[PDB]
Amino acid sequence: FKVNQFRKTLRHVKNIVLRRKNKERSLYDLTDKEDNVKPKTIVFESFGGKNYSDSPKYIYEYMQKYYPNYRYIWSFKNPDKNVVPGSAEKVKRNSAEYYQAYSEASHWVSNARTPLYLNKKENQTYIQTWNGTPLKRLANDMKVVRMPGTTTPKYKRNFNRETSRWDYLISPNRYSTEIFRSAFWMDEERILEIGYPRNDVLVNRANDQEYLDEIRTHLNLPSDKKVIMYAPTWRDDEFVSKGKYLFELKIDLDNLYKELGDDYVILLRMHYLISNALDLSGYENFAIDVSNYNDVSELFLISDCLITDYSSVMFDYGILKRPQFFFAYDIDKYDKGLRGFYMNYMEDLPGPIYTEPYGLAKELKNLDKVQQQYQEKIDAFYDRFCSVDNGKASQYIGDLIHKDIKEQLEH
Amino acid sequence: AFKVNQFRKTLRHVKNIVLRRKNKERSLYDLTDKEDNVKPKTIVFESFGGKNYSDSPKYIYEYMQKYYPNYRYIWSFKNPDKNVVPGSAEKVKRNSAEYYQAYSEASHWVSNARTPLYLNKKENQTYIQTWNGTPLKRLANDMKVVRMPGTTTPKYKRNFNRETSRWDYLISPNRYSTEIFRSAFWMDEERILEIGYPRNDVLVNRANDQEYLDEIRTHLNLPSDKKVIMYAPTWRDDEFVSKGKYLFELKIDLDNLYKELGDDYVILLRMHYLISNALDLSGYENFAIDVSNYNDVSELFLISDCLITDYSSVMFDYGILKRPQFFFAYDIDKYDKGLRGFYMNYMEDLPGPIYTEPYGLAKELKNLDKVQQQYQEKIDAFYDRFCSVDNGKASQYIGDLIHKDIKEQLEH
Amino acid sequence: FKVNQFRKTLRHVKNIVLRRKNKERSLYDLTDKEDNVKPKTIVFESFGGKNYSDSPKYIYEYMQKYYPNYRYIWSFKNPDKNVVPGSAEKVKRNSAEYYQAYSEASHWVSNARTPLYLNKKENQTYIQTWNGTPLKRLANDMKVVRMPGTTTPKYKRNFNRETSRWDYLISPNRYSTEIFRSAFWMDEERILEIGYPRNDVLVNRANDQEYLDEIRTHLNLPSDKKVIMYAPTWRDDEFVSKGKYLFELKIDLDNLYKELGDDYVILLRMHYLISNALDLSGYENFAIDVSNYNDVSELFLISDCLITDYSSVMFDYGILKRPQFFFAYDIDKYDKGLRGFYMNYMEDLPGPIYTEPYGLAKELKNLDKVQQQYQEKIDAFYDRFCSVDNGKASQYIGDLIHKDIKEQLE
Amino acid sequence: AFKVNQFRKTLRHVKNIVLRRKNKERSLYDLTDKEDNVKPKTIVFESFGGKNYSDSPKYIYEYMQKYYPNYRYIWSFKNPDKNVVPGSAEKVKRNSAEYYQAYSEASHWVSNARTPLYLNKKENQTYIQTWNGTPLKRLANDMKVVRMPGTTTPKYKRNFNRETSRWDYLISPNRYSTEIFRSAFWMDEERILEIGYPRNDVLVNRANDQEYLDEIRTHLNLPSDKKVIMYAPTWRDDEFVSKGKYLFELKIDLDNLYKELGDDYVILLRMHYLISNALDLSGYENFAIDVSNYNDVSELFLISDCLITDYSSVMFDYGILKRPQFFFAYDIDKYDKGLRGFYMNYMEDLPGPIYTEPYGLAKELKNLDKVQQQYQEKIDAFYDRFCSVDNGKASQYIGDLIHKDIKEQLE
Ligand SMILES: [Cl-]
Ligand SMILES: [Cl-]
Ligand SMILES: [Cl-]
Ligand SMILES: [Cl-]
Ligand SMILES: [Cl-]
Ligand SMILES: [Cl-]
Ligand SMILES: [Cl-]
Ligand SMILES: [Cl-]
Ligand SMILES: [Cl-]
Ligand SMILES: [Cl-]
Ligand SMILES: [Cl-]
Ligand SMILES: [Cl-]
Ligand SMILES: [Cl-]
Ligand SMILES: [Cl-]
Ligand SMILES: [Cl-]
Ligand SMILES: [Cl-]
Ligand SMILES: [Cl-]
Ligand SMILES: [Cl-]
Ligand SMILES: [Cl-]
Ligand SMILES: [Cl-]
Ligand SMILES: [Cl-]
Ligand SMILES: [Cl-]
Ligand SMILES: [Cl-]
Ligand SMILES: [Cl-]
Ligand SMILES: [Cl-]
Ligand SMILES: [Cl-]
Ligand SMILES: [Cl-]
Ligand SMILES: [Cl-]
Ligand SMILES: [Cl-]
Ligand SMILES: [Cl-]
Ligand SMILES: [Cl-]
Ligand SMILES: [Cl-]
């Protein structure tokens, strides 16, 4: 007597009869067999289906060029609002096609967690690129998580469930592997220290001027000015008033304009929620909202320096050996002498830590003085965290997948 | 790998449960019935589709009650509160949760008729079919047409075959029946037990037990000085009319019977239930006793000095007593003329006279010893063909087979 | 949540999960709403979708000319093997498109029973042309039906369920009307005595020579020769040997070749199982096989006489007032004095009964004499069965449909 | 024809029936529970979730036994065979068919703790909640955080709130508790009954019944010439170690207490059940008596000349006797320093001294009368604020309200 089949049937009958939107899900759970799997079908999703971006984008673009005869499926929250190059067909999350796609594909490629109601058969290969060298503690390494609806243990039980389905897990650096192996409950075998595919352009194209010039004129940037990128992490604290009118960025734009307006334009990469509350009138041709731009790596390439605080992008951008400033206005509130980070944040990062934005501005005045004054520290950072990206990472995965699926076209 | 048969049952059950269908109990049963539900020491009995406590299953039960008390006995009825069973046995109602339990758990099914096809007989269970009499009329595979409503002949036979293929043992009264059963029921001879009917054991063991004869006689308030005629005509479709409120008095003419025999004889009328409760025996009290609703027909045989029937299978059971029999076949013309829709040659080798009218019949009944003498030959011949098999040990043979069957189950 | 829907709902989960082919149907049963009806969609199917032919063909061809702007859908067993003129799109039986079409259509037009799993809603108009004046008892009027799998009462129950859905039933004559009212449990209110649309050409085209010539040279017929058509009904009796080699026709082609070979050509219209068993080597240009020809009416037009036995076609061919012959060779088998026929076969049919071929051949020698000898009976036949055909049947229907769907557009 | 909520139950019951889930008795009860099921004179008692025959429910029931013998009284237990109930009541085992009939049929429920959210309190029933005592620790709504396994703070509170919404009447021992209940349990003062606790009736009515004081004392084999000290420390996670095989002897130092207090005292130790079965009181017979398993804690008070405790709701019950109390809070520092995780001002308005070391406690214990006088001032304050609301009639009040309710329902 098959007792799990019985439960899925009940559940599915309950869904059909009540007209629940998950009827499509329960049908998939009932009927999902190892035999639906067709070896030349590949699904990609990035950030839970929100973009066409990141390592899955670059993995997919590489494969479109060298292996065009496989079936490619992209998964999207809203497929109609996402443009995808090449032969790939797109599926809407939780649609019948979503589930066919995952039931059928021999390889899943993602950069974040994919849902546990999806079945990763012994027959399929789930490759997790993940999404950056960690700074804040994550997964198993966390202490508390007062996240509504779920306890710390149940949140970790679930995370561990998901990481066990990871067949391969890409890695950028020894430091990260040491961390992943613990945080994600990983077997080092499954880890591939080959760098992030999304960071291929940062090596392969860092000098292609024709290419830097399409990115710049696609953003309408001034020809005479250098580019400062500012990418603060999301903060819960600073949300108030429906989010209708925020208090001008802590970084003081009026001041930056007075200081830097002659030599610089600043790209602001905020959380989407801050992005549509920002009034940038008075700052046109100096402050450029850029939150809603598909490819952040392209933004790095055209950036002469980077301002952030507690973000993983600092490791990505470090590949370019350009200066970085850490405007950490709220560093006090963050646990004083916080080890809530895997690295020693007070000591070995590539640039100056500023708690106020006014000395930051002055420092920025002359970029080259920073570049020498921190070349010692920059190179060091490059050596720990970036000395592994080849620019061949998309290739490596792409080839692995191809190689993987030749095996399956025999026995 | 997906279990499709299970899936189908789950849907069928969900349907019944949600729709508030009476058959929910059945589908719950179908869905869960494991081979591991069977308890070797449990045994179900049913007779005639759960109408009675009677017939051969009754007598198998009563024997095992005596020599094998520690087993679990279940009896199945349509209406259990209206049936009385001696002994340790419990009773379940048909189509009830307890009914399906019982048939699920039982290592042995005992009955005398078809049991439904919605019951599942596992490789785990032994189904003993005693059936219910030496055939006169063609049955099952041997019939030519069955214009029975809703159903064709092929499909009626297809279903009967489905049933008999579940019969682990089939009881047989005589070589004649074994020949027929082998054909009509698609039976392997290996499975036939030629041992006579457990219900006919009393016909051998007790024909001379005067005290027992007397309970039966007194239970029926029979006058003492009076000999006993049993009349048992088969049912006839033709003769049903008027919602069945008032029937035309019996062809056999009771008024005439009373005039000719009302002094020496009493006559027991074993009719079909629909005639029985339409009969008006006003004016024949102490001469014509209705006995249709009497629970044990063999007891009626024991106190019967002769039988009058027509086209029944009882003529075969009553034949063990070697007493006189009369066949009042008034409608024999209508029954196909020179008909072989009977297994035996009805026109030659029965133990008595055929009478198309009831008046010659009565004159004959006047002198019973002359009839006995007149036909002894034809009687002894009928006895040798159809009744020379009953040891009166049929009830015993079956109980000892069950008992032996379940011992070897309980060890292993 | 309604019980009838829960029932359909469960059956479809069954089909979807079990991959039953009937999933298309259970889906259709679920979403079949009265609102799906587009008042200007019309479906046509003839003989259960084997053909593009018969009375539906003609109602269709008429509407194509005078009502081009409607959605015409034709339904077939194998659409890729059927050629349909005009604006009609075609669908396969039991496909999603099949159920769409039938759900959406404001009008069903066919000449045979269409299946009970299709829902004819209050909203739609089912026009039944049926397929000919009966000679054999049908439906309610059959005494017994020992047909495999089903019982006589259950068979009539299902036929009754189908006829109760026919909003209009066509009728060729008063005799047919009388029989339909009983055999099909029909109200006279619902019968249209107007004649078969398939018969339109028999009245309108019988003197069209350019048309008779197309039909003739398409069949590759000799030119100086007159045409006999032979159409025997099928007999279970005569099927043997898997059907590989049959016994040559009781009509005796050799004899007919000897006797008529110089004056006539003869068209054999046989049951499809006999057609692919017939060897006609030795008779090229004398005996042509015409069993697969799509349009039987045209074969009548170019026929100078009809030889049949027990067929509803005699009634059709009667419109032309030409000679007919009845080669009833097995007529003794058929129940001796059988009244399992509605009409008095032994008497009033339009030509002589022959039980042997050879007297039939002598007779065929001189047709004109036959026409004379039987003009009285041919006329009485024409009067009783064929004098209803205006030639306007296809028009009447197409116009009825047109009038019917002008109302719904409000 | 079929309603949605009944469909969902109908499906849950199918699951339990087919899968042989113990919970089938529950799903059936959920399907069949009708408002007509209720029998106006059936009454169910359960205390501390069925572990006991005890507390306010026992006493409400003992009253209603003497005065209303004609009603159907049902007691509910985890293990009914391990409990003895005086009177006509029939016992039922939790989660059995009988359990659910009992709660379905009863016109009135009586409990001193939370009854399960799966039981339906029909609009037909009256659920009287005695609760279990004047709080000192913040409870329910008023807790700040509860990192309790399997559940979150907001989820925990939602569930508590669902449960109190079902309380028709809530007993209260004092206005202090009323002010608190109103907030913590989301109550409406309409529903609060300030009658004092039933369990505390014998503290008033029998403080002098010498034949009754004597039965208790000889049930316990207590020495004749000796006075009684009771100690009742709350449970502390910290002190559990080693599977709980061998504990570290109590901080109070029994050896000392014996030397100092032996010639005049005997000490009743009422510990957690887990410490009780770990205590080796060998060499202390007739001095320290293990009293942890005694059914009726109120009897224990009656016979106590004083009470040593620490952070307990039982100080408020004992207060009724206007006898001395000591608070041996050895771990007071650990407990949040100046903790306001209490409702009252612990450092100030309790009816005795706070001791962090046991040696002064003992030297003080020496002369009761000296403490009774030195502290009368505070014992009387305590007794006005927390203990002045006890009639001795709480059981009668409750009993009489039930009776009154079920005369109406008898029309
Ligand atoms: Cl493939
Ligand atoms: Cl390829
Ligand atoms: Cl979309
Ligand atoms: Cl990360
Ligand atoms: Cl869970
Ligand atoms: Cl970003
Ligand atoms: Cl299932
Ligand atoms: Cl057993
Ligand atoms: Cl035994
Ligand atoms: Cl009953
Ligand atoms: Cl009984
Ligand atoms: Cl029989
Ligand atoms: Cl009579
Ligand atoms: Cl009988
Ligand atoms: Cl309904
Ligand atoms: Cl279906
Ligand atoms: Cl339309
Ligand atoms: Cl038009
Ligand atoms: Cl096709
Ligand atoms: Cl048809
Ligand atoms: Cl219909
Ligand atoms: Cl016809
Ligand atoms: Cl049918
Ligand atoms: Cl007529
Ligand atoms: Cl031939
Ligand atoms: Cl509802
Ligand atoms: Cl449950
Ligand atoms: Cl009551
Ligand atoms: Cl127990
Ligand atoms: Cl509730
Ligand atoms: Cl409390
Ligand atoms: Cl207060």
Swiss-Prot record, chain A:
The GO cellular component terms are: plasma membrane
- Alphabetically list the UniProt keywords: Cell membrane, Cell wall biogenesis/degradation, Membrane, Teichoic acid biosynthesis, Transferase
- Report the GO molecular function annotations: CDP-glycerol glycerophosphotransferase activity
Task: Cite the EC number.
Answer: 2.7.8.12
Catalyses which reaction(s): 4-O-[(2R)-glycerylphospho]-N-acetyl-beta-D-mannosaminyl-(1->4)-N-acetyl-alpha-D-glucosaminyl di-trans,octa-cis-undecaprenyl diphosphate + n CDP-glycerol = 4-O-{[(2R)-1-glycerylphospho](n)-(2R)-1-glycerylphospho}-N-acetyl-beta-D-mannosaminyl-(1->4)-N-acetyl-alpha-D-glucosaminyl undecaprenyl diphosphate + n CMP + n H(+)
Membrane topology term reads: Peripheral membrane protein
Pathway of action: Cell wall biogenesis; poly(glycerol phosphate) teichoic acid biosynthesis
Q: Per the similarity annotation, which family is this?
A: Belongs to the CDP-glycerol glycerophosphotransferase family.
Q: What is this protein called?
A: Teichoic acid poly(glycerol phosphate) polymerase
Q: Which organism is it from?
A: Staphylococcus epidermidis (strain ATCC 35984 / DSM 28319 / BCRC 17069 / CCUG 31568 / BM 3577 / RP62A)
**Gene expressing this chain:** tagF
